[PDB]
């Protein structure tokens, strides 16, 4: 039961349920509690999926699930507590996030992500709000409520997926198959956001999102993305925007930074860099582990 946990404060909602900060009254441990009220449709698929996958995934860059508690009107997930989410951190930072910290965070996220993909898990909601950081310099993937265990090869999965700003063009154009590449696209957007301090593609709708991506990466054609003109939601009326220099997209980034980002934001999912391959990109040659020096 929740006799031993003292609720400190509500910190937000994400994907499903409400996340609280709490304290174990006996051990002192600070934890995060995700509450689920049992829509009487039983335990929700989002809870079912997050729990079995998070129990499979032990990695320094994936959030640690500590316990699962049922108090037969609710279901609690008990996580380790870190400091704050990456969105919190970026709103607080005038100052900027220094490059060595960006490199380090990106490096860790790719490790967390390669671990997911190697273990047949799509996260499908990678965004700053779902990435968690501590005082020591670590960053972890969290909120696996939209995740799933995929097969090889993939079949058609839920089309809803990924919050708009971070949503890969293959989902937007309605491809019947999507896979691991969609998590890479999302990390690309986050990479850019850490550097620019603003979201890369802040669309208010699907078409707005597509147009914002096109005005940065060029409208795709059959040479750059074989098959694209045949996709269900591709329209021949799409305006034809020219591709722009990556030195203009993320100006502070040096040669390797730009190279990695363009490989992460490649239109063709099959040609888009894997998280595993990205770990060896020369961008990371001088990677360290600085502290965020947050509060």
């Amino acid at each position: 039961s929740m006799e031993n946990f003292q609720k400190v404060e509500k910190i937000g909602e994400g994907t499903y349920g409400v996340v609280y900060k709490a304290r174990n009254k006996l051990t002192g441990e600070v934890v995060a509690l995700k509450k689920i009220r049992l829509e009487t449709e039983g335990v929700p698929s989002t809870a079912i999926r997050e729990i079995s996958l998070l129990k499979e995934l032990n990695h320094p860059n994936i959030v640690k699930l500590l316990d699962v508690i049922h108090t037969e009107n609710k279901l609690y997930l008990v996580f380790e507590f870190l400091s704050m989410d990456l969105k919190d951190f970026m709103d607080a930072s005038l100052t900027g996030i220094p490059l060595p910290l960006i490199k380090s965070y990106l490096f860790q996220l790719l490790q967390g992500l390669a671990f997911c993909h190697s273990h047949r898990v799509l996260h499908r909601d990678l965004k700053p709000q779902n990435l968690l950081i501590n005082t020591e310099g670590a960053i972890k993937l969290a909120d696996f409520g939209l995740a799933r265990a995929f097969g090889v090869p993939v079949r058609t999965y839920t089309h809803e997926v990924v919050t708009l700003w971070y949503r890969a063009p293959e989902i937007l154009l309605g491809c019947k198959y999507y896979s691991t590449a969609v998590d890479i696209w999302s990390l690309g957007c986050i990479f850019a956001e850490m550097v620019t301090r603003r979201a890369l593609f802040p669309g208010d709708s699907e078409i707005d999102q597509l147009f914002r991506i096109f005005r940065t990466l060029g409208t795709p054609d059959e040479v750059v993305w074989p098959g694209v003109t045949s996709m269900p939601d591709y329209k021949p009326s799409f305006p034809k925007w020219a591709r722009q220099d990556f030195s203009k997209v993320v100006p502070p980034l040096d040669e390797d930074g730009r190279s990695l980002l363009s490989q992460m934001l490649h239109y063709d999912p099959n040609k888009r860099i894997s998280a595993k391959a990205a770990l060896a990109h020369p961008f990371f040659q001088d990677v360290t582990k600085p502290v965020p020096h947050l509060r």
């Binding site: 449709e41 190697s118 097969g151 090889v152 090869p153 058609t156």
Partner: protein, 257 residues
């Protein structure tokens, strides 16, 4: 191709950890193999009625066998375990799972909603929320990538044969999904094209024909005897054009090796 090897290795790890107890039915006081066969055949019908993925069918059976491996159940409650298992599998695997009310409907007024919901919680507690189980299907789709070239009749027959193995705990509960999938694929490929388990899969899996023989011999018998089997929902399912009517094909009388 990226992650395919890692995923295969990892699935080969998890099938061992997700394996039910081989001789649990002996320790079940009130239920039998035949009763479980009735239950599994019914799940096939449910899957057909609600147009569910085969993967969901396989997941449910794994949940059932793992649950029955630690909990004694009376014959009258076996179907409740089954219904709750199918519901969870649907929530795990399906884009659009059926509502709980639909699961209460196909029980035929046998159990109540509250009973189904409580059974869901019990199965979860007993399985400790570990629902991402490797299945025969998950290996089959991987094995299909080694065809030269892809043959749709071979795939359907493999899926068919792999599905038949779900019905009979004797002898298939002693074989891993990766092994049943191996035997199903070779047997399928041999029936349609006259070819055998390929060198490229020996490479990938490390299973040879010699290693698959024990399972392959059992599956050959089940296949030959499938029309006389008391449970028939799988033969009727794979009669349909959706699966290229592969259940209507003639099984071979010898396998050579």
């Amino acid at each position: 191709p990226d992650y395919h090897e890692d995923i295969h290795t990892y699935l080969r790890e998890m099938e061992v950890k997700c394996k039910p107890k081989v001789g649990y039915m002996k320790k079940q006081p009130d239920i039998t193999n035949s009763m479980r066969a009735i239950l599994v055949d019914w799940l096939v019908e449910v899957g057909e009625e609600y147009k569910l993925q085969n993967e969901t069918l396989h997941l449910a059976v794994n949940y059932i066998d793992r649950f029955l491996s630690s909990m004694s159940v009376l014959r009258g409650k076996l179907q409740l375990v089954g219904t709750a298992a199918m519901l969870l599998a649907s929530k795990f695997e399906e884009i659009y799972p059926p509502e709980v009310a639909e699961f209460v409907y196909i029980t035929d007024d046998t159990y109540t909603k509250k009973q189904v919901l409580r059974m869901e919680h019990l199965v979860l507690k007993v399985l400790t929320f570990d629902l991402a189980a490797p299945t025969v299907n998950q290996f089959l789709t991987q094995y299909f990538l080694h065809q030269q070239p892809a043959n749709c009749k071979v795939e359907s027959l493999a899926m068919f044969l792999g599905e038949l193995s779900l019905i009979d705990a004797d002898p298939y509960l002693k074989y891993l999904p990766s092994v049943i999938a191996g035997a199903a694929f070779h047997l399928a490929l041999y029936t349609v094209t006259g070819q055998s388990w390929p060198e490229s899969l020996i490479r990938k899996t490390g299973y040879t024909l010699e290693s698959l023989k024990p399972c392959l011999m059992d599956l050959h018998q089940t296949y030959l005897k499938a029309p006389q089997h008391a449970q028939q929902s799988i033969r009727e399912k794979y009669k349909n054009s959706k699966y290229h009517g592969v259940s209507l094909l003639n099984p071979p009388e010898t396998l050579n090796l």
